[PDB]
Design a binder for this molecule. Structure first.
Ligand SMILES: Nc1ncnc2c1ncn2[C@@H]1O[C@H](COP(=O)(O)OP(=O)(O)OP(=O)(O)O)[C@@H](O)[C@H]1O
Ligand SMILES: Nc1ncnc2c1ncn2[C@@H]1O[C@H](COP(=O)(O)OP(=O)(O)OP(=O)(O)O)[C@@H](O)[C@H]1O
Lengths: 299, 380, 218, 299, 218
């Protein structure tokens, strides 16, 4: 199998013949490709990564004055632990008294307005039982049908505020990703096509000496896969310089706002896939260009 | 000749006028006792109105506490519940919340914001009800105070008129106290004066006499029915109304002091002893300072409460079976001609009316129209 | 092993280069193709080799018709002949050793055999001194001789030369013609298009003249 | 004069010689250019919406009973009008009486609860120097605990969260933008360089007679601007078509979750700037690439 | 006007193309340049043009030393010279009218004069019918004559021909030589490098011979 070795040697020599032309082509492929691989940090890190629950209606029924310490278990024995519910958030009586004081609601009226009649209640976490939309909905009033709980401030939450992200955001970023994953194909294909167009003369010369249809192809394919592979490898060398640099900024805003979002890098399971995809793109572009320019010299 | 007659007339001129003035203006003193009876009824009404005004002042103090402390402190609280939108609260909070809302949605739904406003509305309804009730209680206290004040003004006018009348009658009473009488004159003119006083007493007794006989007959009928029920193998228990009707004036009974004490005070004279001359004493006399009361020796109907010479506006409350221990020199009148008064319950507060110098409760134990010994008539 | 039966070739545009050319060349036969400038010589050689397609008539090569050849069987026709072009059609980015050795590589020969055969064929024209040079570092006659060395390196069955002795002086032209004759003494049919009158006057070979696309020479 | 026409005609001739190659190059340039334009659109629209939402809060020091007309004048001479303050919002007494009545809180208690003790709100927007939370920090407490008003309704650091979000939508989008402009830089440069390398065979003009370097250059400069300009022209058409697609869906979501804050396009000045910059970059790349060849074809 | 004084040229790599060349050529003097392959003829013509730089000695053209010419003055020297190369060095994507006319475009001449002069120069070599064909649609001799027509169009002062007859038959070779003579009878200095003998034997002109970069004639 000396043909494979000879073709690889020819492709390597052709690439090394113009160091400034080869380097300036690898440079544009790597920069045009780090954008998909750095914008994938955002949708893998942060978004999805730090998924903190959602506006779920833990809101529940409002208990009357009959609620007490014993009635808390009784409500649990009926709706807060027997019907659809996961957790217990019964802040009855003094529990939602100092917390209500230190919230946005200012205190001091309790010492003046006799006693605060904080309408009793108990936020719940509708477990599978009532979790289901309809499992709640109808049985949501059935959940109310438990112990006392005069009222039922059970709510919904999320509202349209949970649409200005599943809608506007759910299309624009995908569109941008599609744009980038078309740009990379286009730039690799254009570079390889122009490389073959530069040396079409040798194609013609060695075609009219005999040769074959496949002999002329191999040095151009191996030189088109090696251009995509070498341009993707430098994008992985990059896109870690940028992400580690960006880690400092994200770490600073972690404490200022609250929960500390943790940044990370690209994994091997996606690095290998990226290298393979770029190699295949370069190979297929080289095949297309050479086959197009091989039917030109067939009078 | 004529000189002897002129001298005799001059010596015997003014005795009859003095005695007549004494008796007539002692009757006028008893009339002053009746006027003081009207004034004392007005004074009891004024005391009831003063108790009502004191209760209204206590209710005004309770209204002060409840509603005015509501106003001051609990309306600092109410306007702070409203300040949760006006003063250091809310300001129409519509700002979007951040991720992980620590309440701040349950807050505005029902918690330190939403249930704050809900309990504020509940307490505002409660305070509107409290303000309406404060207005209603102020109207009620004002009505009570206006009743008290109108009664006080009317009673003050009536008491001023009665005081002028009593001043005139007191001048008359002094004119009465000017004179005295003699011995055989005592026998004759005292028979006459007692006849007049007992004539007033018997007018009152004829007005209020049927009650004792009716009650005695009712008690006898009740006893006969109870006895006949046993003869028929049953028990005849009179109803509440029947028992009340039967036992109203069932009679005085044996004198044993089982009735209410008419008044507390020392006793000076004894029944059947030497009171005035050879005539037997009509009954025991409670000799003490003026103002000590007197009443019947047992439950019954008042036989007399009106102006009478010597005994004043005597409350001759008949204890039944003819026993009427009169409230000598009484200065009041409660059970007039037609009404009734029991033992202890005085048809008139005794005093120094009718010419008597002080309260001498000459409780005459009239048994079959004759004086009886009242010494064993005190047991409790 | 070359037969032209009423061949005609007109290029796109309206220039009738070849009209009614018929002739025959036997296995192992030399001939000279002569004509004026613009006559139709390189067109005839292109038709034989396989580069161009006739508009009419038939071309028979080695007894098999090639007037309508598939694009898959052409490389097995162009492999039996050694063609010497007029532009010298070199790979200017390779060495001259690689240029001469590429036919053996195409045919699939070994390594030491490639080295020996390339050295022999480069010695036969005098360019062994310059086997490490790129074709930019050669004169015109030396590039011509590199092409000639490339042609004969694979022991062909036909030699098709297109003015192979231009840019060469008379001594070198005679040497190249002697090399062609020594290849033809083995049984290689030669057909050499030439503009030289002195070179052909001193030898007795069949001479196909061609006057404005009309053979009338044989 | 005539040389300009001849050079332009030659540039157009060699552009139209190979329609597929020039079309592919233009497509690559336009695809690589439509990304930063969309990023700048979304950044500008988000910035406009954020500026319209809330520039600064109106939280101030809550006044005690010491506040009056003269005390309000003193508070103006101290903080409300002399210290960091943009406007005056002294709503003392009846000013914050009807406003509180028509606010979310129900009124009418004034007729019953004697007199409403409305505070003397003295809202003022601090200047840029005092706008900063770090600048506020102690000074904000110092301004609150200066004189007059007793309590202090401090801010919830909503401005700080907006500032951190802006810093992210700054640093990160700035790095994305510089990456995109580098990408288009290299795409234009490489395409022009490779086209000149293919048509390099015109050493003949330089060798033949005194075709000075100025004469040789002009067909290549004008053919470099025509390539960058056509890339920018196709991007503007492609960019605006794309946003119209992702506008109707985006605008509807904004209406549900608030107000329909739609997406605008580019002003005429922005389009002219883009076209001019692309043409300039193409001209520079053509100059560099040609001067590279004019030196290695010399003795 | 041409003058070489002990000029030598060793190409980078260790190949002494020329050594110790010295000669003088007056205005309006025709001469031939002959030698074997690889002698160093095209190198002499390149030194005269300015494409290559001598490693020693001095070169004078029209009385101005050009051995150390700058890079901003080579254009005017190359304008004063009409040269035809061995590769014909002609643009493959322009009509032959444009190829012949580019020297006039560079010189800065009007339009009617360009059309008239290009027609005359194309007719002199017999190509006027092909004024619209691209160079790919010509033969070897026709491309040669396109190069000749481009050279002689600008009425030069020195004409440097580098084998302008190879690829042309004998009648065309005589026609080309007669054209160069009709240019030289005005006062144009012609230096013609060639190694065909039937042309430089029937005409008596000075002949400079080279043999491995040493002028054996002068
Ligand atoms: N590719 C082409 N397309 C069209 N016509 C062509 C082409 N090549 C040559 N011709 C024309 O065909 C005719 C013959 O050309 P050909 O190449 O056969 O000439 P030739 O005999 O090689 O000439 P020379 O002796 O000068 O080399 C001429 O009219 C020529 O201009
Ligand atoms: N670019 C170059 N680099 C190195 N050596 C070169 C170069 N061009 C030519 N030579 C060498 O210089 C010498 C003379 O070459 P030149 O082309 O001047 O000869 P020539 O007489 O024109 O040849 P021919 O008669 O075959 O056309 C030869 O040894 C040749 O190989």
């Amino acid at each position: 199998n000396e043909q494979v070795r000879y073709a690889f040697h020819g492709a390597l020599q052709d690439l090394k013949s113009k160091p400034f032309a080869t380097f300036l082509t690898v440079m544009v492929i790597a920069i045009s490709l780090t954008l998909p691989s750095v914008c994938y940090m955002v949708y893998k890190n942060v978004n999805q990564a730090a998924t903190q629950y959602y506006p779920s209606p833990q809101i529940t029924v409002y208990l009357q004055k009959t609620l007490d310490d014993d009635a808390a278990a009784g409500v649990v024995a009926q709706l807060q632990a027997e019907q659809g519910v996961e957790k217990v958030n019964y802040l009855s009586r003094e529990d939602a008294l100092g917390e209500f004081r230190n919230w946005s609601g200012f205190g001091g009226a309790l010492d003046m307005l006799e006693e605060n009649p904080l309408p009793a209640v108990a936020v719940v976490i509708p477990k599978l039982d009532f979790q289901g939309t309809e499992s709640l909905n109808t049985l949501r009033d059935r959940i109310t049908q438990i112990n006392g709980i005069d009222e039922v401030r059970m709510d919904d939450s999320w509202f349209a505020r949970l649409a200005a992200l599943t809608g506007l955001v759910g299309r624009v970023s995908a569109m941008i990703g599609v744009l980038m994953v078309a740009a990379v194909f286009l730039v690799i294909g254009n570079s390889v096509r122009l490389s073959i167009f530069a040396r079409r003369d040798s194609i013609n010369v060695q075609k009219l000496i005999g040769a074959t249809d496949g002999f002329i192809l191999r040095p151009f394919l191996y030189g088109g896969a090696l251009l995509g592979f070498s341009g993707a490898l430098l994008s992985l060398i990059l896109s870690e310089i940028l992400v580690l640099r960006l880690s400092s900024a994200v770490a600073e805003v972690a404490q200022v706002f609250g929960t500390k979002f943790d940044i990370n890098g690209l994994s091997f399971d996606e690095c290998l896939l990226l290298l393979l995809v770029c190699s295949m793109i370069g190979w297929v572009a080289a095949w297309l260009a050479t086959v197009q320019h091989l039917r030109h010299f067939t009078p | 000749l004529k000189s002897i007659q002129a001298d005799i007339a001059a010596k015997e001129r003014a005795v009859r006028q003095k005695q007549q003035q004494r008796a007539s203006l002692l009757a006028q003193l008893k009339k002053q006792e009746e006027a003081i009876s009207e004034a004392t009824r007005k004074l009891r009404e004024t005391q009831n109105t003063l108790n009502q005004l004191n209760k209204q002042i206590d209710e005004m103090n309770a209204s002060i506490a409840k509603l005015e402390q509501q106003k001051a402190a609990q309306e600092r609280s109410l306007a702070a519940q409203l300040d949760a939108a006006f003063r250091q609260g809310e300001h129409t909070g519509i700002q979007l919340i951040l991720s992980g809302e620590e309440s701040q949605r349950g807050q505005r739904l029902q918690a330190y914001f939403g249930y704050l406003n809900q309990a504020r509305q509940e307490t505002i309804a409660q305070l509107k009800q409290t303000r309406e009730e404060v207005a209603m209680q102020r109207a009620e206290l004002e009505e009570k105070q206006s009743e008290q004040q109108t009664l006080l003004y009317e009673q003050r006018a009536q008491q001023a008129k009665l005081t002028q009348a009593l001043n005139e009658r007191k001048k008359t009473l002094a004119g009465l106290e000017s004179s005295i009488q003699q011995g055989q004159q005592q026998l004759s003119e005292l028979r006459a004066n007692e006849s007049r006083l007992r004539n007033s007493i018997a007018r009152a007794e004829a007005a209020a006499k049927a009650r004792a006989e009716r009650e005695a007959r009712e008690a006898q009928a009740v006893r006969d029915r109870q006895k006949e029920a046993t003869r028929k193998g049953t028990t005849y228990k009179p109803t509440e109304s029947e028992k009340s009707l039967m036992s109203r004036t069932g009679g005085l009974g044996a004198p044993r002091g089982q009735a209410f004490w008419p008044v507390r005070g020392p006793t000076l004279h004894r029944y059947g002893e030497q009171l005035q001359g050879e005539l037997r004493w009509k009954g025991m006399v409670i000799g003490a300072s003026e103002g000590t009361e007197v009443k019947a020796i047992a439950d019954g109907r008042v036989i007399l409460a009106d102006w009478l010479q010597g005994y004043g506006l005597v409350v001759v409350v008949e204890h039944g079976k003819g026993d009427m221990s009169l409230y000598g020199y009484n200065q009041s009148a409660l059970v007039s001609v037609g009404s009734q008064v029991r033992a202890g319950q005085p048809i008139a507060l005794v005093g120094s009316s009718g010419g008597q110098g002080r309260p001498s409760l000459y409780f005459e134990i009239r048994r079959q129209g004759q004086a009886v010994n009242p010494q064993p008539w005190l047991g409790r | 092993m070359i037969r032209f039966e009423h061949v005609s070739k007109a290029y796109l545009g309206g220039r009738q280069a070849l009209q009614g050319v018929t002739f025959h060349m036997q296995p192992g036969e030399m001939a000279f193709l002569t004509g004026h400038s613009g006559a139709g010589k390189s067109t005839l050689l292109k038709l034989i080799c396989g580069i161009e397609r006739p508009s009419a008539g038939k071309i028979w090569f080695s007894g098999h018709d090639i007037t309508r050849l598939k694009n898959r069987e052409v490389p097995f026709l162009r492999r039996q002949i050694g063609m010497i072009f007029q532009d010298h059609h070199l790979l200017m980015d390779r060495t001259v050793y690689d240029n001469v050795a590429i036919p053996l590589i195409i045919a699939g020969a070994s390594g030491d055999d490639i080295r020996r055969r390339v050295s022999a064929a480069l010695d036969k024209v005098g360019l062994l001194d310059k086997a490490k040079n790129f074709p930019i570092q050669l004169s015109g006659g030396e590039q011509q001789r590199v092409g000639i060395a490339r042609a004969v390196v694979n022991k062909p069955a036909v030699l098709l030369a297109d003015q192979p002795t231009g840019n060469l002086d008379d001594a070198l032209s005679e040497g190249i013609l002697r090399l062609f004759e020594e290849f033809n003494r083995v049984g290689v049919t030669v057909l050499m298009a030439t503009h030289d009158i002195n070179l052909i006057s001193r030898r007795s070979y069949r001479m196909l003249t061609l006057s404005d696309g009309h053979l009338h020479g044989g």
